[PDB]
């Protein structure tokens, strides 16, 4: 769904206000390849400690499900650039499937990414989505079997989503052999959320096949401490993380 190279951002929807949401978006649509929003829910199990404390926050303050597609909606007058919904089954489960889809859609976005999506539904779920105009977008981590990550990349009409949950401040081997795998297997390219904290992690991670790199948690620390005055030092962050 985006250019090889690219940097993508991942922000939380609602943290700490939607309209500030709005503002870090437009502020960093400029080096953005593509760009992840993510949907707080009460139990993000599956994130680490930084995002999970941004759903928290996201969540006090008072974010409604559909705030996200409000934010997604106002985006769009400004910017075409690549949208993925980020978010756990259940507030999709609650809303109706192809309902939430739909309205994803028609908001603007172009694919989704269900973190912890129960197998069973799988099929069902990529049927509504291709059938709604959603591309798919799935995770795995280090700890995925190159079986499974064949059969995630053949399910996914987006892009393979590598994580993990290691932190750091160096990339875990773990991390580079997961993306090591996944390049020797999908056709699908591949975005990495490793973690990124510094320059020399993308440029690394870019050298070795990873179409794009994702930055969430070092912008969600700026946002967790600066709140709305985040913007301007995510413009640094960026900046420095792309040599810049």
Partial sequence: MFKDGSLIPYLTAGDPDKQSTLNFLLALDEYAGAIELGIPFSDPIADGKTIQESHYRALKNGFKLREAFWIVKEF?????????????YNPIYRA??????????????????????????????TEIAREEGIKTVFLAAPNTPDERLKVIDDMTTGFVYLVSLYGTEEIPKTAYDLLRRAKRICRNKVAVGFGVSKREHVVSLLKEGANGVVVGSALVKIIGEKGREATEFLKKKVEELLGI
Wanted: proline share 5%.
């Fill in 76 to 88: 769009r007058r400004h910017s075409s650039t690549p949208i993925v919904l980020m978010t756990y």
């Fill in 96 to 125: 109706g499937v192809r309902n939430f889809l739909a309205a994803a859609k028609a908001s603007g976005v172009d694919g989704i990414l269900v973190v912890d999506l129960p197998v069973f539904h799988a099929k069902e779920f």
